[PDB]
Every structure is written in C-alpha cells, then in structure tokens.
C-alpha cells in the first residue's frame, strides 16, 4: 500500500500487542459462536473453600468453515509490515511498509499442527523466542503443504511419502540450529492434558483428538502408502481461553468431513544436560498465541 525507503525498523515478534489483541477477539468469537451446554471455571477467591462457578445454557449445534479474519489499526496507531521474504521476527528490516489491515487469517483452534495457514515463500523456516531454552515453543513453517483428511468415523489420513519428505526438511533445518553433527529424533508427546498429547482440533463443530505417535517416530542423519491416525470425538473439553471445563452435546451428523492443509508445526525440544549428542523433538502447542504469532511475526503496531 505505502512503501518506505531509507528507513530502518526494529521488530520484536515475541513482544507484539497485535498477538494479545487478536487472542481476545478470537476467544470472544468462539465463545459466542459455539456455546457449551455446561461451563465450569474455578473460583478460589476465599482463603479456604474453593467455589466452582457453573453455567448452564441452551446449546444449539453449529458448524461452518471459519471465515478469514483481519487485524486493522485502532484509532491512533499504524501497522508496519516487513517485506523480507525470510524474516526471523527480530532485528532491523529496511524493506518495510505500512498497511491498513493485515492479510486474511483463519482463526483455527488446534494443537501440534497448524492448519490452513501461510506457507514460507522459499525454504522451510523454524522460529523460537529462545532456542537454548527447552521450555519455549518451536514454530515450524513449511514451504509445501501436506493434506490431512479426517472423518467423524474415527480417523485422519496423511500420505506417508509426503510426510516423510517434510520431516527430512525439518530435521535438516533443526540440525543447522543445534549443531551440524547432531542426530535428529522425533518422539511422541511426553504427557499432559488430552488437548496437548493428541493432535487436537475443531471440525464441523466437533472437537477431534488424534493420536499423532505415528507422525513422530523417526531418527535422522544417524512401508504403507498412507498414515492413518486413530481419532476420538469428545464432549467434555478443557478450556483454552482460560482454566476450566466445558461440555457439549453429542454429534447429530453422520458425515463429518475435514480436509485441511498442514502448513506448520509446533514443537518442543527435550534438552537437558546430556553429553550424548542428539536432540529430541515432540509435538507441542496449547497456547494459541503461538498459533497467532506464526502469522503475525512480520507485523508491528506503532503510534502515529
């Protein structure tokens, strides 16, 4: 829209107001769009007894494909955008610009895998807020999409060959970050809430939970055409906008189908004091701010 020259701008994608603002707008939307039969939130104000707050309401079944949402500048501010084909989110960017709104973003709620997102324009790209810290999330962005086909009848499908090529590119990128002599190893999730241990996502209004062990079980730099993930649909859900629980009614349709493109991943690295040289990576996620950061890394909002 409006380009700039002879101007340097320091970005910091791990300290971005747009990410927080978007997180609330999204919550508000899901909150009001898909309503639970019962809502449970903890309330422990009193020093002693804890009081669970309960809400019961009419819960109509609803399903439609999330419409792209845009972020636009609030009165007083402006949106700068970095145009470097491969920008890591931090430091100066001279190929900068100012825009009305951001690009169209699908407000997808999911873990482990990022769906229907933006692709890297050149090579596969990995990004973190602190790589040496094994607790911080590693966001992968792919340069090629991978289909994942899911059905309410209990499974998801991925082509093995396509997924294997993808793993090769991530491992390649990973070992470049942690030492060119390291062995890259993908393992299943190590534990936690169901929404975190499985590849969790929403589809036709129903919450799916898919065992992703088969996607994360290989060793790099040391047979069956499609990979079929077992899945469950669930009625009792852990909240993601805050701490609590939600119950929905059982499905009313017998033909729930989701085709999606895997455009990125969320990983966590094992780490830990080990003179043995090999890094272990497991699927991660849970904080949707990471999901939003993978789309907004190239934006910042500045006062006019």
């Amino acid at each position, epitope marked *: 829209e409006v380009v700039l020259v002879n101007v340097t701008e320091n970005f910091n994608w791990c300290k971005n107001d747009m990410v927080e603002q978007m997180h609330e707008d999204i919550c508000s939307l899901w909150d009001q769009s898909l309503k639970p*039969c*019962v809502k*449970l939130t903890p309330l422990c104000v009193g020093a002693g007894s804890c009081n*669970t707050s*309960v809400i*019961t*309401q*009419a*819960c109509p079944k609803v399903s439609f494909e999330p419409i792209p949402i845009h972020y636009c500048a609030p009165a007083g501010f402006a949106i700068l955008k970095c145009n470097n084909k491969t920008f890591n989110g931090t430091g100066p960017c001279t190929n900068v610009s100012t825009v009305q709104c951001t690009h169209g973003i699908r407000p997808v709620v999911s873990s482990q895998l990022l769906l229907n997102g933006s692709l890297a324009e050149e090579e596969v790209v990995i990004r973190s807020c602190n790589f040496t810290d094994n607790a911080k999330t590693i966001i992968v962005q792919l340069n090629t999409s991978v289909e994942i086909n899911c059905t309410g009848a209990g499974h998801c499908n991925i082509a093995r060959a396509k997924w294997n090529n993808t793993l090769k590119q991530i491992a390649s990128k990973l070992r470049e970050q942690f030492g060119n002599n390291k062995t890259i190893i993908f393992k299943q999730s190590s534990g936690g809430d*169901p929404e975190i241990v499985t590849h969790w996502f929403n589809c036709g209004g129903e919450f799916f*939970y898919c065992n992703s062990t088969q996607l994360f079980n290989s060793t790099w730099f040391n047979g069956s055409d499609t990979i079929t993930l077992p899945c*469950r649909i*669930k*009625q*009792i*859900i852990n909240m993601w906008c805050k701490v609590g*629980k939600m*119950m929905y*009614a*059982p499905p009313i349709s017998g033909q729930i189908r989701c085709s999606s493109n895997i455009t990125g991943l969320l990983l966590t690295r094992d780490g830990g004091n080990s003179n043995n040289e090999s890094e272990i990576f497991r699927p991660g996620g849970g904080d949707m701010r990471d999901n939003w950061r993978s789309e907004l890394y190239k934006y910042k909002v500045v006062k006019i």
Partner: antibody
Amino acid sequence: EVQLVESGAEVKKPGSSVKVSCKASGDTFIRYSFTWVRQAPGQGLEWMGRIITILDVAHYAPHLQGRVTITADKSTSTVYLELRNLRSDDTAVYFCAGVYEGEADEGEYDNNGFLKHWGQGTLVTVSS
Amino acid sequence: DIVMTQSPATLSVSPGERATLSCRASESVSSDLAWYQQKPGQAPRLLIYGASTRATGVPARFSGSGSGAEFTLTISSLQSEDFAVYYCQQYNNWPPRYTFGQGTRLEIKR
C-alpha cells in the same frame, strides 16, 4: 451393571429436612449420571433432578428449585438427596435411578435422559 | 413446561391380545421419549428409549414408535406379567426439565 441400594424409611414432621442416600456398586461410578424421581401414594412419577456425577453439576425441577440438593461422594460411590422445608405433600416414595453415559473419564459423554437402573425406593412420610 | 398426557387412563385387554398405548406431548420432543413399566410396590422398569429402542432384557412383543409430539407403545400379545401401569417420559429439553405422563393402567378383561 450397577446395583442401587437406598437407605431406610424416614418419618419427619413438616418443616423438617431429610437426607436420603443411594449406594451404587458394580461398575465405574463416574461413568453414570444419577436422577431422583418421587411418587406420592396413588399418584404418578415426578422427576426431581439429575446430577452429572463426573462434573459434579446438578439440575432441578422448577417447582422444587431452592429447597432440594443432589450430591455425590466419589470415594464411597454414594448419591444423596436432600429435601428442605418439608411439607405434608412431600410424603412419597423416593426413587434413586441412573444410566451409563459412556467413557466419561475420557471425555465421552452422551447425556442420556432415560433411567435404566433403579433402587428399591425409600418411603418418606411427612406428618404431624 | 412440556406436558405429557397418556390415553386412555385405563385399558382392559383380554389375555393374549394386542394392546396399544399412546403418549402425546404439548410440543415436539423429537425422539427423546421413553416408556416405563411399573407393578404395585416395585420400582419402575425401563422398556423403550429413543422412541423405539428396546432395553436389555426386554421381550420382542414390546415395541415403540413415533416422533415429535406423537408416540405409541405396542404389546402384540399380552402375557400375565404384562398387565401393569405404563409411564412415558420426555427428556428433550435443556436445561433439563424432564417430565412424565400420568400413566395408563393396563388390566385384564374378563
């Protein structure tokens, strides 16, 4: 296949309160929802309320609301009904019932409204 | 609230013949409808649920049908142990305000 066994008959003065219990055994307790239904001599069945055992959430009939409470003690597979401010018209046989809801501890929950397993009933007489 | 009303109050059937009970609702309850059987001094017993599904242990001669605001229960060949009071229930609404019909007494015709 659960077996429901209720406590003994009660006799109360009007204005009193009552707490009837129901022991469930044979199956995984948190996979069942439980309901209380009463019946007055010569009358029909009346739904009083229902507890979602795994969430610990209960719902009641509008005409009882405010003076009835259903709870559940997981450590002893026991369901309780409390009825406050008793009246002579509360005289009834009080039935405890329940039904399987699915693998609730794994997030599967059907929310069945029907009643498959019944206790033997507890007579509660309310008189001066 | 949703009112359930059964007809008739009393139904006199000769042994071994067919009986037909009806349950009517004051508004649609879809297929969230169950029938119960009760004998003097005993707890009720679930017969049918979802409008038309027999519960475990229930003999084939019992069968229910209907949807919305209109339901029937059929016993194709009355045995001695079939004569009792029958109750229908709806459990469609949310928050739950489930309700019962006043019952149909099924007695022997002689």
